[PDB]
Design brief:
CATH architecture of the largest domain in chain A: Sandwich
Largest sheet of chain A: 7 strands, mixed
Number of domains of chain B: 2
CATH class of the largest domain in chain B: Mainly Beta
PDB class: rna/immune system
CATH superfamily of the largest domain in chain B: Immunoglobulins
Entry title: Crystal structure of SCV PTE RNA in complex with Fab BL3-6
Radius of gyration of chain B: 21 Å
Keywords: Viral RNA, Fab, translation, 3'cite, RNA, RNA-IMMUNE SYSTEM complex
Helix content of chain B: under 10%
Distance between the termini of chain B: 55 Å
Oligomer: heterodimer
Assembly: trimeric
Shape of chain B: elongated
Structural class of chain A: mainly beta
Number of strands of chain A: 18
Chain A: BL3-6 Fab light chain
Largest interface: A-B, 51 and 51 residues
Chain lengths: 215, 220
RNA sequence: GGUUGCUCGACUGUGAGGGGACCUACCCACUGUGGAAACACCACAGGAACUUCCAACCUUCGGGUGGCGAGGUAGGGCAGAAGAGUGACC
């Protein structure tokens, strides 16, 4: 039978200088064969605590492991902003080895309103029959933001796709790119294209827009 | 230190196919260390895969691969291998290579990881991006639109990497074609518009596609 | 005929708490540390505890030293001893 590493919480928002506690609970005893790893987006994992309380070579004293029976807990005394990452427990007490589902940690800063811009589809693209309109919400926080496309004052539904940056660890902020896509024919059927942002840092939903053709 | 791990042999593979990942070691010999493969499906977690024990060659495998994968090692080549057979979709992941540390120093911790190779099990064929420019209009923003490619990954640098600051390149999202589209943007002060050349460099190795799209202002 | 010595000796026994610690060599194991070491290989240390013993060594005969893997194979040791001899005595 496999040893389960059951980590919680799935995710953690907290303030710089907070204490954050992540707990992992091994379905069987794993002695002290528990290791904690920090993984930032796109990088490899990096070792933090080996053998469940032993601070790895070169890891900052604000990290620490803690065993209590079948319960292991990684503990940051005071967040720095760089400490944005996903954290995983591992057990190597037996094979197969096993990891926690991880815990995603988020910085917390004051609010910043999004800088907003809108991009009308490039002239090469419209030749190729496609028409993509891009709207950018730049360097903002918190990430919870509503975008609404309106074409000739009609709300659009199910033809935009957005994506977000991770927290710029220096910035502790986010950037979003919402993308309305139409056929060239459907693009040539309307004049005005607009992008309506509702964000907590805005007192009023900001709209950047353009007309088809204006130079 | 010189301790380094270099995965390779990843890519796009048809389901049911095979692949042999490779992991070259630098600055240490793998003869004295336990060596593990660890994989991560996109935006999912770390999954232990296989491992081979120093001095014995004893191999251990995660149960989701047992009898389709095969960890192994050539001492002389200071290289560790992983033969994957009868692959399926859910085998898609970045496949990382890690050195289990020396016991007296780092317990059974994995102390050195590679950068991981990307394994993309799908029958859909490759297709490189069309790259369109995002024209701008005391600062405003401009970028590139990296549209309808497959598979991941693509890479954007502006001005051959000379322009690093202010840039946001967004994660590819999945077009309902199945292709990936993404866009990259940098903000600049509006003065530089006339006098500053702004090229984004797009590379999509799976397709052997390299594009450089000069981003200039509104023509009129 | 006994009785008792003395020598050789088939063969057997080394027996576990109201009771078993003999030696050696290989083999096979169990536990723990350490070897660049989760398994494997290697080196080293150890086989609960309280007892029990002295096959072993030393002894001023008071005692002392050294000593346990209940595994297997083999050779010994220590004990018995079918049996032969061979004395002494009656």
């Amino acid at each position: 039978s496999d040893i389960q590493m059951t980590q919680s919480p799935s995710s953690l928002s907290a303030s710089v200088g907070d204490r954050v506690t992540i707990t992992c609970r091994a379905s069987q005893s794993v002695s002290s064969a528990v290791a904690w790893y920090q993984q930032k987006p796109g990088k490899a994992p990096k070792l933090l605590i080996y053998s469940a309380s032993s601070l790895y070579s070169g890891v900052p004293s604000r990290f620490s492991g803690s065993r209590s029976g079948t319960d292991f807990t990684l503990t940051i005394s005071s967040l720095q902003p760089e400490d944005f990452a996903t954290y995983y427990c591992q057990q190597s007490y037996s094979f197969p080895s096993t990891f926690g589902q991880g815990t995603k940690v988020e910085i917390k800063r004051t609010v910043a309103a999004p800088s907003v811009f809108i991009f009308p589809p490039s002239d090469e693209q419209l030749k190729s029959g496609t028409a993509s309109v891009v709207c950018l919400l730049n360097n903002f926080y918190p990430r919870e933001a509503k975008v609404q496309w309106k074409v000739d004052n009609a709300l659009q539904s199910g033809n935009s796709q957005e994506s977000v940056t991770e927290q710029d660890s220096k910035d502790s902020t986010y950037s979003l790119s919402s993308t309305l896509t139409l056929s060239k024919a459907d693009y040539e059927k309307h004049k005005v294209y607009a992008c309506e942002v509702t964000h907590q840092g805005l007192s009023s939903p900001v709209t950047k827009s353009f007309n088809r053709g204006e130079c | 230190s010189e301790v380094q791990l270099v995965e390779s042999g990843g890519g796009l593979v048809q389901p049911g196919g095979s692949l042999r990942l490779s992991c070259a070691a630098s600055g240490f010999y793998i003869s004295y260390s336990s060596i593990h493969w660890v994989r991560q499906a996109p935006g999912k977690g770390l999954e232990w895969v296989a491992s081979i024990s120093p001095y014995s060659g004893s191999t251990y495998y995660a149960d989701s691969v047992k009898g389709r994968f095969t960890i192994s090692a050539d001492t002389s080549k200071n290289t560790a291998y992983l033969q994957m057979n009868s692959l399926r979709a859910e085998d898609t992941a970045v496949y990382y290579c890690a050195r289990q540390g020396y016991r007296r120093r780092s317990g059974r911790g994995f102390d050195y990881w590679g950068q991981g190779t990307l394994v993309t099990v799908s029958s859909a064929s490759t297709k490189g991006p069309s790259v369109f420019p995002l024209a701008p209009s005391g600062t405003a923003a401009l970028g590139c639109l990296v549209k309808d490619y497959f598979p991941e990954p693509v890479t954007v640098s502006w001005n051959s990497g000379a322009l690093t600051s202010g840039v946001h390149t967004f994660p590819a999202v999945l077009q309902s074609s199945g292709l990936y589209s993404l866009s990259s943007v940098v903000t600049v002060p509006s003065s530089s518009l006339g006098t500053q050349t702004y090229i984004c460099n797009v590379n999509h190795k799976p397709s052997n596609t390299k594009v450089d799209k000069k981003v200039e202002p509104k023509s009129c």
